[PDB]
Amino acid sequence: QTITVWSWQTGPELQDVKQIAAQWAKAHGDKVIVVDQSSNPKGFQFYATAARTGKGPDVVFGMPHDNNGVFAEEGLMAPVPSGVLNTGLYAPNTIDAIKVNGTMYSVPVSVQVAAIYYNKKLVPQPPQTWAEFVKDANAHGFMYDQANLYFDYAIIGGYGGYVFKDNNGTLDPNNIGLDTPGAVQAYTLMRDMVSKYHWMTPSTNGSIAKAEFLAGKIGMYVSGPWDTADIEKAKIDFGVTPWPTLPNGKHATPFLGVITAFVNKESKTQAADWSLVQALTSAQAQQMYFRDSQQIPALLSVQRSSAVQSSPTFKAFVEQLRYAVPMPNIPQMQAVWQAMSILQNIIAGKVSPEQGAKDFVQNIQK
Numbered sequence: 001q002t003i004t005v006w007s008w009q010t011g012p013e014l015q016d017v018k019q020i021a022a023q024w025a026k027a028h029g030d031k032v033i034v035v036d037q038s039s040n041p042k043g044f045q046f047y048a049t050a051a052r053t054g055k056g057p058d059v060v061f062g063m064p065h066d067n068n069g070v071f072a073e074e075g076l077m078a079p080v081p082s083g084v085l086n087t088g089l090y091a092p093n094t095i096d097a098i099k100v101n102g103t104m105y106s107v108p109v110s111v112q113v114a115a116i117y118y119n120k121k122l123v124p125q126p127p128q129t130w131a132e133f134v135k136d137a138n139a140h141g142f143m144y145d146q147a148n149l150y151f152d153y154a155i156i157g158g159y160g161g162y163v164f165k166d167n168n169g170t171l172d173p174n175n176i177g178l179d180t181p182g183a184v185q186a187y188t189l190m191r192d193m194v195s196k197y198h199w200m201t202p203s204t205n206g207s208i209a210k211a212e213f214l215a216g217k218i219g220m221y222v223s224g225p226w227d228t229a230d231i232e233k234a235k236i237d238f239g240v241t242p243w244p245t246l247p248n249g250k251h252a253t254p255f256l257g258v259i260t261a262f263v264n265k266e267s268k269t270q271a272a273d274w275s276l277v278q279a280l281t282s283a284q285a286q287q288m289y290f291r292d293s294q295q296i297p298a299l300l301s302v303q304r305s306s307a308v309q310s311s312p313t314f315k316a317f318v319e320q321l322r323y324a325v326p327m328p329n330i331p332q333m334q335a336v337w338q339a340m341s342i343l344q345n346i347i348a349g350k351v352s353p354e355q356g357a358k359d360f361v362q363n364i365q366k
């Protein structure tokens with residue numbers, strides 16, 4: 001009959017997913033419907049919302065790995081069949097990212113590490129140290145999704161903060177590091193980018209920063225390959241560079257995100273589903289996704305290809321990978337995303353960095 005795929009990746013990559021799915025259907029006979037969920041107001045967790053009522057898709061494509069802890073815990077994901085995944089074809093952290101309680105629940109398709117996207121017309125040579133960064137930010141502007149933990153964690157970790165303690169590949173949900181002296185130092189710098197450097201105002205966010213960058217108004221912003229298409233469409237002669245070292249001289253620690261594909265536990269055609277997932281996540285598929293958006297392949301063999309090794313996106317990626325922190329995928333991580341709004345209060349000056357940190361962790365525990 002028909003197999004439904006929900007994709008949280010849009011633009012050129014979605015076009016490729018549709019092309020691959022159509023080629024798959026040509027051989028298998030099953031009609032494949034690909035739905036774009038990238039703009040769904042319910043976000044990534046909409047999968048759980050839908051699956052909980054038995055209205056989910058057969059296959060999910062383009063889901064950031066942190067979300068799967070919830071889905072797996074609630075029994076909404078079919079475990080990856082034996083053999084489908086060869087752990088040796090990926091970096092260690094990539095496979096750990098798709099395991100929940102030791103079980104592999106999804107297939108890695110891409111790896112992501114946020115970086116600074118800059119306009120070469122304004123910033124010919126990218127900054128690498130905080131001092132150089134200040135000079136370029138002052139001269140041509142800097143903005144980003146400042147109150148979004150996904151991005152500002154780069155500063156938190158750079159100062160020694162952390163979400164959940166990672167000891168022996170196992171995260172400890174009870175050991176939170178978002179209220180430590182280091183984390184407070186980071187929150188203070190976040191506030192300072194508004195109150196001291198004046199690069200942003202309390203209202204500045206990701207949407208505004210992207211719009212400003214596409215208009216050629218700011219020389220730098222923090223983003224990822226999901227913006228490649230729009231940046232090129234805006235005809236910006238862009239470059240990609242790692243986060244600069246911070247005021248403490250340490251490297252920023254952006255999160256490592258693994259984009260995944262998986263199968264609904266309730267799907268009636270799971271064998272066919274996994275075959276489709278394999279087609280959507282093959283070396284060739286990843287080559288296509290990279291070609292059209294610069295999304296870094298999860299497969300090491302594709303990363304080692306000439307097109308990838310020579311790209312600016314990959315260069316920034318390999319220069320930050322050792323400092324990147326895999327996002328926690330346990331269910332409790334959603335409570336963290338849900339409480340990060342307090343970062344906005346700190347950045348606005350409504351609450352001190354010290355008090356805000358305390359409230360952040362308390363709101364997370366809740």
Ligand SMILES: OC[C@H]1O[C@H](O[C@H]2[C@H](O)[C@@H](O)[C@@H](O[C@H]3[C@H](O)[C@@H](O)[C@@H](O)O[C@@H]3CO)O[C@@H]2CO)[C@H](O)[C@@H](O)[C@@H]1O
Nearest residue numbers: 008009010038044064066067112148149150226257337
């Ligand atoms: O902000 C909370 C949010 O953080 C993490 O999400 C990030 C994604 O992991 C990352 O890929 C990127 O999301 C982009 C989608 O991949 C892309 O297809 C398209 O939809 O645009 C998105 C950005 O607008 O950035 C987000 C952070 O904004 C984490 O994985 C989420 O579960 C969490 O809710």
